[PDB]
């Protein structure tokens, strides 16, 4: 069974301020961390950006998420994003301000992970898992950081991950470097090999490879696939790995591509999300090093669809009770 299993939940307190209230399957209110304990999550996923526009998600913001998740028994995987807003494979954008230049840039990536890591370890909050950037398969920082750009983007990562070993965090957290398609296995293996041969960005200066991996982007997202992959990539570099992003929609009336085959038969529904999350959970677990499952956003009811074309992906009714497949957490 996985060593890590819980939720990226980001949103909930502008959902608070929203208005948003969440209750565990029998009704009973109350703050969302506990409801999560309650289900068997045993850590949260926190994103943060560097200067957000409207503060959301910045470094007070996520302390804030820490302290509340702490109080609850759940660890924390702080999930770095370095960009004022959301970073992904289209989009790493560098907040504006910093440098033009790539030691100035990777200073400054430096500074800032080292200042943002000793803001929890003086707040006193134990970060368990850091991701040095947010599905950077494309690189980050753009334009020094992105792909092809392989020694600044090694250079870059250095960089970062250090900016956490110097910090006050005892014990330091498991630093990961997180790419999207976990099932794609060349990709994976295109990324890490053309990274780790540039020489910056060493072996030892990271611990855990972390992946999306999700149905509704393409068929080809077959468990066997991430199976294949994951153990590709631990035989290759002996790093701890696990699934850092996954849903599966309740409703998904209009589908941009096909699902994988291997789950078609798998309805759109509580009971189904139960079945998907189990089985990419046996995934990971299958593999040696697989360690940790994390569901994204799985109470942003606002936002159900969650950028995907399926409707809606929560694990919450569009009023905020907790579903029954969120207590998935148990089982796995
Ligand atoms: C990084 O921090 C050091 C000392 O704290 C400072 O001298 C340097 O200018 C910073 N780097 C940049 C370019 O922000």
Redesign the pocket.
Known sequence: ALQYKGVDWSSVMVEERAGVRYKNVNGQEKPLEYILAENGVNMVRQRVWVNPWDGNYNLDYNIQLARRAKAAGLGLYINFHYSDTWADPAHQTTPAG??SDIN?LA??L??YTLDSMNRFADAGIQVDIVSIGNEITQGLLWPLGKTNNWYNIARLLHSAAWGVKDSRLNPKPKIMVHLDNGWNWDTQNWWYTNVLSQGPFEMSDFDMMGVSFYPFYSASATLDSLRRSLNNMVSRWGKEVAVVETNWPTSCPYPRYQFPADVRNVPFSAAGQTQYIQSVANVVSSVSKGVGLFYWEPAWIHNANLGSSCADNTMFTPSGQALSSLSVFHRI
């Open positions: 910093w440098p100035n200073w400054k430096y500074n």
